[model samples]
Target: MYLRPDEVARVLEKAGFTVDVVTNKTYGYRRGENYVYVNREARMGRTALIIHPRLKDRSSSLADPASDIKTCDHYQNFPLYLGGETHEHYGIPHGFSSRIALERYLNGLFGD
Candidate 1:
């Protein structure tokens, strides 16, 4: 299930997750404990992404960036500088996965 960032955001929203598109045009969705940031600004080869615990989910597996707003170094040294901002996006391919994968991961773990 290759989905766009908006797509992941919508699914979460449909499940009652409060979503918002702010700053670098990313989707931030959360209910209470887990927080997932979604967007389509990664390097490439990715249709969508789901980054969790931007706040705190306690997942054993988590890639917590120093800043919720990703930096271009996130580009595997392929930095992008435009509009005086460090473009943020999914760096690790495993951070998130395809739509079905993500959906299962999300609800399977949280039941939301």
Candidate 2:
């Protein structure tokens, strides 16, 4: 989920999700009842999908327990958020890279 903000927005649109610019660097994307947010922390270079609250049910079981084991050492004290057993999250870098990648990734979670 590491990407530029605009890149995130593009994927959201392609995935049939709509976005609302929450800030200059933050955009909120909604797909049905799911949420995938893109933004950055100044220290994290204002990059990555900063949050993915309550990853869709289909994707919820897709979380990696190994990722959930470690805690971030960043100033924000945020976790790597690799999509796990939680209501809110910090990151989900797997299966994501380009706009097309995001579409595929999201499709797995929310479908076409």
Candidate 3:
């Protein structure tokens, strides 16, 4: 349920959902590109799309469940995120410390 901002509009259009472009100050903060937030109720039997980036090291402390937010370090930021459950299943608490670690881990997993 995660996607880049550009993919949002196209996905919505394909689903036959109509949306109006309105500016809200909350989404006005420039974070690499223009972003918008849309709220709609999930229809019965319809797939609900929730778009958000997968962040790395989002937890402030491993012991505190309530502390969840991305770190300010540029190197620690991860755009493509898989849930913690998936990582835990793979036996890696945090997938990678850097892009190199992630690449190496995937290569090892896939035997590539």
Task: Identify the candidate with maximal lDDT.
Answer: 1
Computed on alpha carbons, the lDDT of every model, listed in order, comes to 0.48, 0.47, 0.26
- Assess every candidate by TM-score: 0.50, 0.51, 0.22
Quote the RMSD, in angstroms, for model 1.
7.8
- Model 1 residue 30 lDDT? 63
lDDT, candidate 3, equals 0.26
Encode model 3's per-residue lDDT on 47-95: one tens digit a residue: 1122223312332122112123322111212232356433211111221
Q: Which ranges of candidate 3 are over 4 A from the true structure? A: 24-112
Candidate 3 deviation (Cα RMSD): 16.9
How high is the lDDT of residue 23 in model 1?
40
Count clashing residue pairs per candidate: 1, 3, 1
Residue 97, candidate 1: alpha-carbon lDDT? 40
In candidate 1, residue 45 scores what lDDT? 19
What is the total number of backbone clashes in candidate 1? 1
User: Which of candidates 1 and 2 reaches a greater TM-score?
Assistant: 2
Error of 1 at 112 (Å): 7.9
lDDT at 38 for candidate 2? Answer: 60
